[PDB]
Amino acid sequence: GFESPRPYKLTHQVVCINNINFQRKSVVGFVELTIFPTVANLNRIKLNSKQCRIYRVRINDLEAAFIYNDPTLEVCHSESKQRNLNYFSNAYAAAVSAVDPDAGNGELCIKVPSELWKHVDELKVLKIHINFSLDQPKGGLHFVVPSVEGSMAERGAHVFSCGYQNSTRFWFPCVDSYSELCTWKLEFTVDAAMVAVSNGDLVETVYTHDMRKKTFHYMLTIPTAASNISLAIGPFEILVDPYMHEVTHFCLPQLLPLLKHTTSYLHEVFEFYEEILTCRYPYSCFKTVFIDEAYVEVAAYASMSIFSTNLLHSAMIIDETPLTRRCLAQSLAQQFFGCFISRMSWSDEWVLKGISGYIYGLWMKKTFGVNEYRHWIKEELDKIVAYELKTGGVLLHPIFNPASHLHFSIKHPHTLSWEYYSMFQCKAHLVMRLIENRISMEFMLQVFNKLLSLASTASSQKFQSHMWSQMLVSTSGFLKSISNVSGKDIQPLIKQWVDQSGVVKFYGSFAFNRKRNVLELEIKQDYTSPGTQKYVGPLKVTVQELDGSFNHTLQIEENSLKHDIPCHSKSRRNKKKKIPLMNGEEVDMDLSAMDADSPLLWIRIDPDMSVLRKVEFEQADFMWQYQLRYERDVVAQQESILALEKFPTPASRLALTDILEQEQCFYRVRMSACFCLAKIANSMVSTWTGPPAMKSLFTRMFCCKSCPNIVKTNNFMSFQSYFLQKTMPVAMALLRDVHNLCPKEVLTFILDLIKYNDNRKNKFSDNYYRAEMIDALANSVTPAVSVNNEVRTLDNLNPDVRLILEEITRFLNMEKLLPSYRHTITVSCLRAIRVLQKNGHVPSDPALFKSYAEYGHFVDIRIAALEAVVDYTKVDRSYEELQWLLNMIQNDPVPYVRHKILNMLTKNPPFTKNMESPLCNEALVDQLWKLMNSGTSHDWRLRCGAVDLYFTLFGLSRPSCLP
């Protein structure tokens, strides 16, 4: 049951936009809402509006009086001397709650005229006509006007609706909540050479009487929220999908072949999401818009998605096809379960984010294989076991503070840190995988189909929300639908992993009792760490003995420590028979390293990742080597690679080398075995016999049979030896001499890989392989032996580093004439120049990176150069570079770059709270408090980034370096 927090119900909204002026960056328009009051004596009506100048408001064609105030413009007063962050977080939460449409509130308060009170008490319709104007919007909407001359279509000027969650208040007045569903009528009067893309279906396109402008009329009969309404106006090249004909793809001019190749996969994503769920795609059209200077890499609205143009690749670009493919896939998953089925509160957001991430993981499983699914699930779980042990924990479904271990309030999406938002979505889809583990996948897809079917029977009624609230899901409704389809309720699992905000830590060690033939496990939990919680459920453990692989369920109550499980025979060591594996197959194992008295080959605690856990198991090194070689699970091979770094014995070198030589191993395991072999090789110097590690293996796999030092000409058509070939010198460059210097046998090998590179024969580009070669050249740089702080000049350069510097100069200059796909070699060469500057080789001068961080460059070059400037101002304690970065945060045209500068200055801070630095003035505290209070008031993501930066630099209490 859904009861509105608003005293009115909104039925229909007309959004008309005229006079989109690109020179002056200005729009004019009106908005006409059709509300039905649910309570008599409505009097004031409270709507949401930011940055719009409200000209006049007429209610039922009668002139009404409005008052506007935004408490989130300046959160605390300018003349308050408070400088602690808990004060700002409480004041910011109160300010966002005072404009919240999820309460009754709002920023624009319109007073109902007196003569309509007899029209409002007996509950009859009210039609509110606001007309507004955006004069020059800051972050309200995306504006991109290039400085080439010509007409606005000839220079490539486009508009996007930027922002996240409820950010539609930034460009027209609305009820900007996900719970106020209404039908829509959208008119946009644009230039005759431009096209206006928006939500709904385009019913017509009429000309103006001078035929210089045309009006696009859109209609949206599926009741969506105001927060799902978007807009993209530009000179877009239109491409109808040749497979599905209601899907149109819009790109920027001159990028039509890239659009043709890139969006050619999307029909398979549509077919997948419509056959695992049994509902068809709910909207009547689908539109993909590719734009410049995007807010996020992929945004999903109702019947529309806005991607950045940096996803567009051609047919000869690999290492970008899977990333763009999965961006399209998660936009479509959010089309199904973020835009059609919406949110009932700010709680129950974990339901939608979990269903979106879970069905996108099912797509990844079918498309890229289970191996890639398991690797992705493990990397998401490690991300969580790192973030939650780092700071507190992520609390899905809080109850309204519920989480007081973090420096922000979790009551609203616009007060969350961006890393918390990312980890929120990550934990939501892992908890949905856990619900699939308890209640099987076909019942899970039946739950999702029942939600979609209730929403689509709801979506066709005309009753103003008598039935339109069946399109809003809640937690209680989701659990009730689960209990309807399965008969089991998941309330212990919901109580543990949703309502409780923690992950578990397992420390395991075994001992084999030879007398009674049992395996005595010893599993203890660390439940006193700040991020942890105590697990009391069951726990699966998989033991591989000589007779095969056996699963055991252990009951781990609070007082439990020793778990005795039984062991089988050892009669497959009496005769040589094959040892049967986890799957149905069996292999020949070399049992010379195994103990004579124990049959068990390896043990895995929680193999299926059925809890949110971090396992620290103490096996013997031969058990880790057997688990690396003969396991049929990629996460166990990865964890054995990760655990073999502590055992540098030559049997582990043989194990990793046998993994590296082995095709029919998953390629991301071999790419990890490269770096593990490099670390082991560095640890057993003065024992290593022959050549450096992986060199003979590289010449055996990727070089000519007649010439060992000449590499084969590039043929990248295998896509697994391509990735292994481009990752093996990067790990090989981490080899170190006894003298702690990279050997001149590996550096010469990398330089010969660079010289003899011929790419005139493959059908694929070479930009990522050459960029990884520059990364391998940067990995070999050891710190220089400066004497008496000698100035680093050209004559006293290292003889090794002169070759590296010549190569990166040649590569960067050749990129200036023949550019790569996304300037990958510019990014790699800037990163390598920063590596050479971090050691004492090149003079520590930020002027090159400051010239590459200007506005007109590509955004990857810009963020690489700004990363180099952030690293410089951390190491050299530069005041003027920090003022340069803070000025670039305040006034840069691209808001993604501002968010990225705040993000990089949070990750690599110039000082922490423990450090005494010269940069801890009262002036810097006043600048960052002014940046939290004012200055970042237009983005909701810069303000949370400024809160994160103030927390990283000065902590939760009063800045110490202050009177």
């Binding site: 030879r514 007398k515 009674r516 004579a596 008295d597």
Partner: protein, 54 residues
Amino acid sequence: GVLIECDPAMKQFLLYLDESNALGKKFIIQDIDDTHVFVIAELVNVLQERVGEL
């Protein structure tokens, strides 16, 4: 344990008694090599009669 030095061809003589005696859980508790075995302390004097049979 109790270190017992014996012959490689005679080590399996005490192993057959392990799978036949039902007194305790297991007779031999640890086997070092072909000439070194371990044992719960109690059957050296009994083996002196068994050796006559052997």
